C-alpha cells in the first residue's frame, strides 16, 4: 500500500516522469517506536534534492504529517518517500509539466542487518565505476542504474557491500552506504562533489566527528591509500553504522571508531 | 492509453523498478503510413539494452506484433516502447525480481519538426557534462536525468538543440540526437563507448557513410576541433536528420552532407 498525493493508491499514472526518466528523488528513513529517526534531516534532504532538480513543491508540512502518521502505524521498520516532477512536458523538457508527485510507503525492518551488525561487513572492489557529474553529485535522485549494476556484480562475491570508485579512480562510496576509514586519530571520508550520495547518516557522523577529538578530513583518495587504514566503517540511515572486518584479503583489526559512533547514531543521539 | 504486458492499462504498479530506479530501457520509433520505420533495428536495440542490463525476456515476437498493431492504428506519429526489470528484489538487488514489464504507446507526429527542418537548427554548448561509464554507455536506458538537466539549460537560450561534452571535455552528442560534422570529404562522429546513446539513426547513417565515397571516422574530439567543421548535421529516429545553421556565432555554410543523407533516411532507404 502506498499513499500517493494524499490518498491510498496501488498504481501510478504511466506517464509519470519517475517511470519515464527517473525524474525525481527519494529518501529511506528508520522508524523506531513509532517515530521517524532524524525526521528534519529527511525533509531537508528532500527539499535540497528538489531544488537542485528544479522541482517546485509547497506540500512540505503535509508530507511531514504523512511521514509521521505512517511511522506511527508501522511502529518499527523503514519508511520510503519518493518525489517526482509529475507528468507532462514534451520529450525531456520540463516546460508545462507537473505538479509534483509524492509517494510514501513503509515496510518491516529487514532481518539481515542484525546478522551483519554482529558479524562484521566484508567489502569487495566494484568493477563498475561511477561517472562524475557535479550537477547531480550528492543528491539521492532516482537515476540508480549504476547502483543496480554495482549490486549485481557484488552478488558474485562473498562480500556484503562494495567499495566503489569513480571514473578517475577515486574512492567514493559503497553500493547503498557511505564510507569512513581511520588511520590513527585522523578519520577520512570521500568528498562527494563529483559523484556519490551525500547521505543523511554521513552528515550526522561528520557532525559528530567534527566536534570530537578525532580529526575529520574529506578527501580525494586512491584505493591504495584507503586500504592502508587501521579501520573501516560504513553507514546509511537504516544500519545505521556497521564495522568492516575486511576488504579483500586485507583485514582490519580495530573497532574503536565503530564503537564510538554506534551508540550516538543508534539513538540517534 | 498504454498497452502494458498485453492489455490496456492507464496506470502501473508503484513498485515497478522503472518508477523506483529507472531500471530499464526504451525506444522511440517513427510511424509512417501505418508502419514502423526501421522496425527490426528497434527490436534489436531493445534486445541489446536488455542484455547489457541483465533483463531476460522471451516476449520479443509478441512485442513486435504489438508494435505493428499500434502503428497501423496510429497511421502517422511516434511509437514509444518501455521495458523495465519489473517489480521486486531487496533494495537495489535484482535477485528474485521480475518478470519484465513491457509498455507501449503512440502519439501524433509533432509540429515543430517541420519548422526546424525548413529553418535549420541552432546549437548551444551545454554547461552540463555527461559522466563517463562504459557499463552504461550507448544504451538507451531510462536513467535520463542528465538529459532533463541539459534540456533545461538549453531552454534558456535561442538554440534548438545542445552540443554536449563528457566529463573529460570530449564532444559526445546532443540532448536527444546524435551529431555528425564534416570537413571536406571526411565525416566525423563521436565514439560512444564512454557516454552517449548509440542511436538507431546514427547506426543507419554510419552504414550509409561507410558504403559512400565519404570517409567516416569515429573520434574523440575537443569542442574546438568540432567547431572548425564546414557542416554539422544531427539525427534521431524521428527527425530523422536536420541541418545545422550554427553553433553559437560560428556559422556553417554548406548542406551537402545533409542533402545526401535526408532522402535515404526519410524513406528510410
Ligand atoms: C541512500 C544512499 C546512501 C546513504 O544515504 P543515507 O541518507 O545515509 O541513507 C549512500 N549511497 C547511496 C548510493 C545511497 O543510495
Ligand atoms: C534516443 C536518443 C538519441 C537518438 O537515438 P535514436 O535511436 O536515433 O533515436 C540520441 N541521444 C539521446 C540522449 C537519446 O535519448
UniProtKB/Swiss-Prot annotation, chains A, B:
One of its GO terms (cellular component) is cytosol. It holds the Pfam family Aminotran_4. GO terms for molecular function: 4-amino-4-deoxychorismate lyase activity; pyridoxal phosphate binding. Disruption phenotype: Cells lacking this gene are unable to produce PABA. One of its GO terms (biological process) is tetrahydrofolate biosynthetic process. Keywords: Folate biosynthesis, Lyase, Pyridoxal phosphate. Its EC number is 4.1.3.38. It comes from the Bacteria. Disulfide bonds: none annotated. The keyword Lyase applies. Pathway: Cofactor biosynthesis; tetrahydrofolate biosynthesis; 4-aminobenzoate from chorismate: step 2/2. Signal peptide: none annotated. Its cofactor is pyridoxal 5'-phosphate. SUPFAM superfamilies: D-aminoacid aminotransferase-like PLP-dependent enzymes. PROSITE patterns: AA_TRANSFER_CLASS_4. It catalyses: 4-amino-4-deoxychorismate = 4-aminobenzoate + pyruvate + H(+). The modification N6-(pyridoxal phosphate)lysine is found at residue 140. InterPro entries: Aminodeoxychorismate_lyase_IV, Aminotrans_IV, Aminotrans_IV_CS, Aminotransferase-like, BCAT-like_C, BCAT-like_N, Class-IV_PLP-Dep_Aminotrnsfr. Homodimer. Involved in the biosynthesis of p-aminobenzoate (PABA), a precursor of tetrahydrofolate. Converts 4-amino-4-deoxychorismate into 4-aminobenzoate (PABA) and pyruvate. Belongs to the class-IV pyridoxal-phosphate-dependent aminotransferase family. This is Aminodeoxychorismate lyase.
Amino acid at each position: 500500500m502506498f499513499l500517493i498525493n494524499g490518498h491510498k493508491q496501488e498504481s501510478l499514472a504511466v506517464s509519470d516522469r519517475a517511470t519515464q526518466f527517473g525524474d525525481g528523488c527519494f529518501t529511506t528513513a528508520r522508524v523506531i517506536d513509532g517515530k521517524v529517526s532524524l525526521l528534519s534531516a529527511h525533509i531537508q534532504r528532500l527539499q535540497d534534492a528538489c531544488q537542485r532538480l528544479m522541482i517546485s513543491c509547497d506540500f512540505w508540512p503535509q508530507l511531514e504529517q504523512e511521514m509521521k502518521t505512517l511511522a506511527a502505524e508501522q511502529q518499527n521498520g523503514v519508511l520510503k518517500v519518493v518525489i517526482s516532477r509529475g507528468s507532462g512536458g514534451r520529450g525531456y523538457s520540463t516546460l508545462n509539466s507537473g505538479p509534483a508527485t509524492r509517494i510514501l510507503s513503509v515496510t518491516a525492518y529487514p532481518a539481515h542487518y542484525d546478522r551483519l551488525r554482529n558479524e562484521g561487513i566484508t567489502l569487495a572492489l566494484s568493477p563498475v565505476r561511477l561517472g562524475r557529474n557535479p550537477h547531480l553529485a550528492g543528491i539521492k535522485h532516482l537515476n540508480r542504474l549504476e547502483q543496480v549494476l554495482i549490486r549485481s556484480h557484488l552478488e558474485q562475491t562473498n562480500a556484503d557491500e562494495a567499495l566503489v570508485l569513480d571514473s578517475e579512480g577515486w574512492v567514493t562510496e559503497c553500493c547503498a552506504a557511505n564510507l569512513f576509514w581511520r588511520k590513527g586519530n585522523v578519520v577520512y571520508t570521500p568528498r562527494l562533489d563529483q559523484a556519490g550520495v551525500n547521505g543523511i547518516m554521513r552528515q550526522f557522523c561528520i557532525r559528530l566527528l567534527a566536534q570530537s577529538s578525532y580529526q575529520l578530513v574529506e578527501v580525494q583518495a586512491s584505493l591504495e591509500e584507503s586500504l592502508q587504514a587501521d579501520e573501516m566503517v560504513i553507514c546509511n540511515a537504516l544500519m545505521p553504522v556497521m564495522p568492516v572486518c575486511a576488504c579483500g584479503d586485507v583485514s582490519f583489526s580495530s573497532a574503536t571508531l565503530y564503537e564510538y559512533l554506534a551508540p550516538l547514531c543508534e539513538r540517534p543521539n
